[PDB]
Amino acid sequence: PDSAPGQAAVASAYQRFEPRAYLRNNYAPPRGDLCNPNGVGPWKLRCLAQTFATGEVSGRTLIDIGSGPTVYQLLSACSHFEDITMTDFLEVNRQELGRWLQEEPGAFNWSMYSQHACLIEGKGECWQDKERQLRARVKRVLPIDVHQPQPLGAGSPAPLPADALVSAFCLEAVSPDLASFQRALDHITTLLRPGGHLLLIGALEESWYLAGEARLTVVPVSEEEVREALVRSGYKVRDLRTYIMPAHLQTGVDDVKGVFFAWAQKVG
Amino acid sequence: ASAYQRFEPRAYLRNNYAPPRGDLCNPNGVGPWKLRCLAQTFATGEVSGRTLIDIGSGPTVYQLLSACSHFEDITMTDFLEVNRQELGRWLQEEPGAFNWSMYSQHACLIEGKGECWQDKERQLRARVKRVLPIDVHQPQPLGAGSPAPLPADALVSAFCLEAVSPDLASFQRALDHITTLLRPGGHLLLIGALEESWYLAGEARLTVVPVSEEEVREALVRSGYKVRDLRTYIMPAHLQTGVDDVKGVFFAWAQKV
Ligand SMILES: Nc1ncnc2c1ncn2[C@@H]1O[C@H](CSCC[C@H](N)C(=O)O)[C@@H](O)[C@H]1O
Ligand SMILES: Nc1ncnc2c1ncn2[C@@H]1O[C@H](CSCC[C@H](N)C(=O)O)[C@@H](O)[C@H]1O
Ligand SMILES: Clc1ncnc2[nH]cnc12
Ligand SMILES: Clc1ncnc2[nH]cnc12
Q: How far is Cα A233 from Cα A186, in angstroms, rounded to an integer?
């Protein structure tokens, strides 16, 4: 059917997206509380760390899809890829990453996440080295639209196809419905080499979330709907985990019921 | 002992616990080595009990980071009032407190239990019951009727004895004095400078008795200890900074018999 209308609503809504409110909502306490191991923050970092610790996810290049203003999702990844591409639809997010990349004071402070990543990776790495290395390995920050058949545009700067994809809380957060979600997943898959890996983190059964003035509409998906899409896009699912959001972390910034983590390998 | 009246805690903290000696990122540095010695020792599970006294804490807390989860009642001590105030500022989260968070983070890193550094600090602050005056040159270092529970199940002392003693014999007596605070069977974790004769703390120029690993060992034996472990870190050139003339650092794990 028609994708333009729904997508247009999505683009319109996001023009009001406030990175600082989003950061506050999802990455400052209580959700940003890395001290409780039962919290969502540690669960996120744990999924990534353990996945990369298998040694099975490696290569030269990685593309992070819909990075927004966050970098936690690359902390464990950055030791396994020489070349990392970050991306976002919104200029204000790309600028936010720009501040962190220049190590400015005004930048969001990710050091708790960096340290925690060092803690659970168990190699006694200090967090300053971790951060220095991610900053070195991020080779570009690009505009992206996952609804386009070529999400990075034509003749993009990105090394293609990539050995690996990371995407956290993007697809479900920018797709009006499941069909759109599936197509988004189809589009980003054209960027991954056959046999490459996709690490997909996202919200389960979420219909809305706030980022300042902007209230955004999210397609609520289930674990089984996420599995089907991955199969439908040509992936073998290696791992699919579910975190049930505790009530004390359900804060009125959204209606998220849980979080999913998928490690999928593109068939070919 | 009057020289210690000019001892500036911030200058000392700058000299030993800020970069380069303060950089914890390089595993071959003295900071990580010290934390490593403490952690490994406690990780054995052979150093346990209810009460612990830290001897000559100065204005530093790193020496108890790994210890605090093994002892519910902790006593910190120093000869100088200014050092006791500097400790108070960190314990009470006051303004101007020295930031020990790098060390707390590194202890959590080394200990490998998944603990966030804030929990670590929280526990340490909670278990430190009291900060007391002390003088190891006195037969009763803590004085007559101290608030400290005695005898302690364990002692810790870092860079104190050799730094307050003019010579080996004074060093030996100082050790005899603090040994009286320790329950028989108790454990002593002693960390200290090797072959050092002076160091600076702002306007203060302190004298140090230069001691060897073999001298340290013999002293512990003379005081009634069985040396369970004794290691040396040789101070690399890049950490020899004009603040002192230290050659190495010794770590000793001893058990009172
Ligand atoms: N059409 C589109 N194509 C690709 N990314 C988009 C998009 N529309 C919005 N986005 C980005 O999708 C993100 C959802 S928030 C996720 C932020 C980050 N990945 C983290 O894990 O929190 C926002 O940064 C938003 O700007
Ligand atoms: N006569 C005495 N008896 C017990 N402690 C003394 C003393 N004279 C000086 N001290 C304290 O011995 C300490 C030596 S340096 C501080 C060592 C600190 N524990 C750390 O590990 O870096 C100083 O705090 C000093 O004030
Ligand atoms: Cl933990 C969580 N829940 C809902 N939305 C999110 N976006 C990023 N993290 C999120
Ligand atoms: Cl590493 C080191 N060297 C000399 N004196 C010291 N006091 C505390 N740490 C010290």
A: 6
| Coil, helix or strand at residue B142 | coil
**Structural domain total, chain B:** 1
CB B179 within 8 A of CB B138: no
Give CA–CA dist A21/A16, Å, rounded: 11
How far is the C-alpha of B61 from the C-alpha of B87, rounded, in Å? 8
CA distance A5 to A253: 26
Grouping H, G, I as helix, E, B as strand and the rest as coil, residue A198 is strand
Question: Which ranges of B128-256 would DSSP assign to H, the alpha helix?
Answer: 161-164, 168-179, 213-222
Q: Which residue of A has its CA nearest to B117?
A: A35
Per the listing, tokens 């009032």 go with B81
CA angle B216, B160, B21 (to 5 degrees): 95
Q: Which ligand is nearest to the CA of B193?
A: 4
* Inter-chain touch A37–B118, beta carbons under 8 Å: no
> How many Cβ contacts (< 8 angstroms) between chains A and B?
27
B78 Cα–ligand 2 center, Å:
6
Say how far apart CA B120 and CA B129 lie, in whole Å: 16
**Cβ atoms < 10 Å from Cβ of B5:** 10
The residue segments making up the domain with residue A220 are 1-268
The answer to whether A96 and A19 are in contact (CB under 8 A) is yes
Q: Annotated binding residue at B186?
A: no
Subunit contact B117:A115, Cβ cutoff 8 A: yes
Biggest CA pair distance of chain A: 53
- Size of chain A in residues: 268
Contacts 24+ apart (CB under 8 A), A101-104: A101/A135, A101/A138, A101/A141, A103/A135
With H, G, I as helix, E, B as strand and everything else as coil, classify residue A233.
coil
B21 and B32 in contact (C-beta within 8 Å)? Answer: no
Q: Which residues of chain A does B110 touch, with a Cβ-Cβ cutoff of 8 Å?
A: 124
The label of the residue with tokens 């200014």 reads: B82
Ligand 1 atom closest to Cα of residue A27? 22
Ligand 2 center from residue B240 Cα (angstroms): 21
| Resolution to one decimal, Å | 2.4
What whole-number distance in Å separates Cα of residue A223 and Cα of residue B89?
Answer: 50
Q: What distance in Å separates the CA atoms of residue A130 and residue A128, rounded to the nearest whole number?
A: 5
Beta bridge partners of A245: none
Give backbone dihedrals phi and psi of B9, rounded to 5 degrees, phi first: -50, -45
CATH of the domain at B29: 3.40.50.150
B243: closest CA among B3, B61, B34, B11?
Answer: B11
Indicate which residue's Cα is closest to atom 9 of ligand 4: B16
**Distant-in-sequence, close-in-space partners of A210: CB < 8 Å, separation ≥ 6:** A21, A25, A216, A253, A254
Nearest to A35 among B24, B110, B116 (CB): B116
Between chains, do A126 and B117 touch, taking CB under 8 Å as contact?
Answer: no
A37/B114 touch (CB, cutoff 8 Å), yes or no:
yes
